[PDB]
Amino acid sequence: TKVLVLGGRFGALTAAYTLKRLVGSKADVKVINKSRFSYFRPALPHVAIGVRDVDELKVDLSEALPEKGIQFQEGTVEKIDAKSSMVYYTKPDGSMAEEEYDYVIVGIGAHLATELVKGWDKYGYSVCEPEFATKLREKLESFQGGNIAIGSGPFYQGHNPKPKVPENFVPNADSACEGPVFEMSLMLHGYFKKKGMLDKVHVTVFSPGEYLSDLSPNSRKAVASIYNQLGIKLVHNFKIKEIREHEIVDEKGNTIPADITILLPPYTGNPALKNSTPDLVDDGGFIPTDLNMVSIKYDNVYAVGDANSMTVPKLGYLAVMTGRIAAQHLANRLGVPTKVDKYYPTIVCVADNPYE
Amino acid sequence: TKVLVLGGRFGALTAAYTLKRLVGSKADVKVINKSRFSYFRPALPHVAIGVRDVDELKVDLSEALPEKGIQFQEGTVEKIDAKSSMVYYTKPDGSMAEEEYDYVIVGIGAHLATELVKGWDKYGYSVCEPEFATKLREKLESFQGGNIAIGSGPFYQGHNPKPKVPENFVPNADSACEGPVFEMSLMLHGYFKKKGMLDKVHVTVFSPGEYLSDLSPNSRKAVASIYNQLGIKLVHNFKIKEIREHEIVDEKGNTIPADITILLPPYTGNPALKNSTPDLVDDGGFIPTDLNMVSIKYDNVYAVGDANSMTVPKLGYLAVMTGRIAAQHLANRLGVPTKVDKYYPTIVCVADNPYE
Ligand SMILES: *Cc1cc2c(cc1C)nc1c(=O)[nH]c(=O)nc-1n2C[C@H](O)[C@H](O)[C@H](O)COP(=O)(O)OP(=O)(O)OC[C@H]1O[C@@H](n2cnc3c(N)ncnc32)[C@H](O)[C@@H]1O
Numbered sequence: 014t015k016v017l018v019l020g021g022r023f024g025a026l027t028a029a030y031t032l033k034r035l036v037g038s039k040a041d042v043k044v045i046n047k048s049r050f051s052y053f054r055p056a057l058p059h060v061a062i063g064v065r066d067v068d069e070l071k072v073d074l075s076e077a078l079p080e081k082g083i084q085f086q087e088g089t090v091e092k093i094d095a096k097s098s099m100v101y102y103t104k105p106d107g108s109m110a111e112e113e114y115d116y117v118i119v120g121i122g123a124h125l126a127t128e129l130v131k132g133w134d135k136y137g138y139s140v141c142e143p144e145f146a147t148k149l150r151e152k153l154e155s156f157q158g159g160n161i162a163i164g165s166g167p168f169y170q171g172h173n174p175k176p177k178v179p180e181n182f183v184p185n186a187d188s189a190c191e192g193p194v195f196e197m198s199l200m201l202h203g204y205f206k207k208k209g210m211l212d213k214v215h216v217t218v219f220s221p222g223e224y225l226s227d228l229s230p231n232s233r234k235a236v237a238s239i240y241n242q243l244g245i246k247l248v249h250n251f252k253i254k255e256i257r258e259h260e261i262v263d264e265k266g267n268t269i270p271a272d273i274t275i276l277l278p279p280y281t282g283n284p285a286l287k288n289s290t291p292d293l294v295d296d297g298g299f300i301p302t303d304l305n306m307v308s309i310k311y312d313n314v315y316a317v318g319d320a321n322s323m324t325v326p327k328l329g330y331l332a333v334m335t336g337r338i339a340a341q342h343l344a345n346r347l348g349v350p351t352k353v354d355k356y357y358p359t360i361v362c363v364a365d366n367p368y369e
Numbered sequence: 370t371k372v373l374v375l376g377g378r379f380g381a382l383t384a385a386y387t388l389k390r391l392v393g394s395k396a397d398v399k400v401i402n403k404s405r406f407s408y409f410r411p412a413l414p415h416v417a418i419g420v421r422d423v424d425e426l427k428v429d430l431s432e433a434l435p436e437k438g439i440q441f442q443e444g445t446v447e448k449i450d451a452k453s454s455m456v457y458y459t460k461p462d463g464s465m466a467e468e469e470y471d472y473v474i475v476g477i478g479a480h481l482a483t484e485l486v487k488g489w490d491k492y493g494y495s496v497c498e499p500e501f502a503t504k505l506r507e508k509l510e511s512f513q514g515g516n517i518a519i520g521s522g523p524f525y526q527g528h529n530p531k532p533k534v535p536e537n538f539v540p541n542a543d544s545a546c547e548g549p550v551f552e553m554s555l556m557l558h559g560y561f562k563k564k565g566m567l568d569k570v571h572v573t574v575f576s577p578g579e580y581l582s583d584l585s586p587n588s589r590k591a592v593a594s595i596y597n598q599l600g601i602k603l604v605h606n607f608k609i610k611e612i613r614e615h616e617i618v619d620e621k622g623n624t625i626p627a628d629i630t631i632l633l634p635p636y637t638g639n640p641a642l643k644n645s646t647p648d649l650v651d652d653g654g655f656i657p658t659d660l661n662m663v664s665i666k667y668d669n670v671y672a673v674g675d676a677n678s679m680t681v682p683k684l685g686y687l688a689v690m691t692g693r694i695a696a697q698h699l700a701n702r703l704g705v706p707t708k709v710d711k712y713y714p715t716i717v718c719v720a721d722n723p724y725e
Pocket residue numbers: 019020021022023024025045046047048051056057088089090091120121122123140141190193283285317318319320327328329330331332
């Protein structure tokens with residue numbers, strides 16, 4: 014049995030390690046990732062006065078994986094042919110390959126559609142880019158005063174076909190990861206309050222939809238009140254379309270003053286999945302599955318983490334959760350009786366609570 | 370300066386200790402509590418198969434407090450005369466004392482109106498009663514099968530006058546602490562799943578209102594889906610009125626099968642506060658204040674924790690938060706320049722997230 018695991022982070026690693034440990038020699042587990050190293054830093058930075066806390070974990074998949082009986086091949090998946098059970102990918106040297114699998118675990122995540130934002134290259138500051146959050150840190154300390162805009166781009170969620178899961182297990186969201194926006198808004202207020210710059214800096218938070226949509230209307234009104242108190246502006250239904258040097262523009266031509274734009278880029282499906290077997294993926298580019306992480310169309314394709322349709326919001330711990338489930342369900346198939354954990358939706362992001 | 374602190378838990382102790390440490394000799398801090406000891410166990414028990422984890426902290430206020438420069442007097446507050454700044458209370462010997470204060474910090478919490486539930490004495494199992502968690506534990510392990518009902522009683526929230534705080538800082542809730550109901554429902558399912566009794570035991574969850582009201586409809590629907598999957602029934606708008614041996618009845622005379630009734634009693638204002646200066650308290654028996662914890666009517670009365678009107682849901686950490694604020698604001702008044710922390714509403718109970 015050859016099991017291919019696509020990707021190298023939460024979903025992939027969880028599934029690979031859990032699978033190998035569970036079946037050992039009963040299967041060959043191989044991981045294909047677009048890069049040799051996988052980095053795991055902290056969700057949000059620590060904007061502290063004169064205190065820069067570095068804490069990154071760097072994994073070398075080529076060494077770390079074999080050490081666990083898992084093979085590793087670096088390459089960029091270009092498409093998955095679910096019909097012929099082939100994974101097409103480009104190697105670092107530019108060459109093209111395709112490997113057959115008996116089972117595939119898709120953990121290549123989603124996509125941060127920065128490309129959908131005119132002026133991104135020139136004036137954007139992303140919260141999800143590695144040493145891009147360093148560019149921000151430096152920018153924030155040298156900031157003399159002005160306007161700051163913080164928010165996320167729209168979530169191009171797929172809707173059809175639908176995951177084979179109980180009712181209401183998958184929410185409809187205008188934003189894929191919004192909680193971090195609330196936290197960073199509060200942190201930025203703190204940082205500037207400590208620098209006695211509250212009068213020099215003006216923070217505007219923007220949402221592609223209603224803002225923290227897992228909350229009740231009152232809880233959302235409460236959050237707005239907090240912003241009012243802290244002198245933070247809130248603009249709803251602002252689907253960012255462009256970044257200029259001093260402002261951001263929405264799809265309707267409305268603007269927000271912004272000398273510094275902190276953006277969680279729009280979420281779209283992974284291009285490699287958009288280019289895969291049409292009926293493997295939904296209109297968004299995500300793989301709909303059942304509660305066992307098995308594709309609703311191809312019984313030998315598993316989708317985990319961000320790449321799976323049901324993971325909304327797009328959370329690392331849901332990635333780990335789905336990674337395990339996929340691995341336990343598969344182990345059973347490979348003749349190793351294993352308990353398959355039940356999947357739960359999140360209900361609410363705990364970051365919605367300021368006391369967090 | 371004589372500062373009286375009423376109560377002996379989260380709000381009281383936080384305020385007393387914080388105040389004394391902040392002003393030292395600049396004031397006499399004395400605590401009056403209905404009992405000599407204050408116990409601090411765990412919010413919810415640990416229903417484990419043959420594994421009973423005890424972990425309770427027992428404080429002797431008479432020794433612990435003076436050790437910090439805080440006097441202690443045991444007695445049961447009967448009423449507060451805000452107009453004359455007198456606190457009336459019964460001593461252990463049965464005598465009725467009446468002391469005067471320059472400032473008072475009310476931390477006597479709320480009330481668990483078990484008395485409002487017919488048959489409580491005879492067949493009730495409370496989640497908020499010290500060793501009541503014990504009577505339950507023994508009952509649950511001897512349970513051969515049948516029906517279990519779990520939920521909370523209505524919250525007799527006060528509405529007038531209103532707290533002097535920003536808009537939407539205080540929610541309207543039908544239940545004062547509902548999160549624990551969700552957690553326990555999931556835990557009880559686990560306990561019985563491990564005993565292989567899922568078919569022998571039938572769990573029904575009941576809510577005085579629309580359950581987990583801080584959540585969006587879509588999050589509430591998700592929760593309902595989880596219940597459905599787990600075989601747990603949900604009955605909303607069920608304001609309990611009586612507990613029989615094998616069913617719970619609400620006001621309307623409606624029933625829910627219940628051989629074991631796990632109830633978080635209804636929340637009402639502390640009777641001592643209902644019998645205090647009429648314009649100190651709201652229609653519920655809670656003390657409305659501003660963001661500094663100062664009564665909106667008497668500038669030398671502070672209300673902290675459960676006894677304060679704004680603490681909804683009724684949370685220990687909000688008690689600790691309000692306790693600190695009260696103490697810092699007062700310290701400033703007593704000539705000790707101190708930073709007064711900003712008060713935030715909770716937004717959501719993190720227990721709403723099953724991954725918690
Ligand atoms: C951006 C962000 C995310 C976030 C957060 C705060 C911010 C600013 N806070 C979180 C929190 O508080 N709690 C939590 O649980 N999650 C939080 N998140 C989310 C987390 O980033 C994601 O949910 C998680 O990363 C999802 O993991 P998954 O493993 O599913 O996806 P991924 O991390 O993107 O990994 C993708 C892997 O696949 C490889 N890849 C991608 N494309 C290819 C191709 N074509 N070929 C081969 N490999 C590919 C990537 O290199 C990566 O290894």
